[PDB]
Design a protein. Structure first.
Length: 9
């Protein structure tokens, strides 16, 4: 999750 969201943002 941490990784995925940082890409999104
Ligand atoms: Co990372
Ligand atoms: Co990064």
């Amino acid at each position: 999750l941490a990784e995925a969201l940082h890409l999104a943002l």
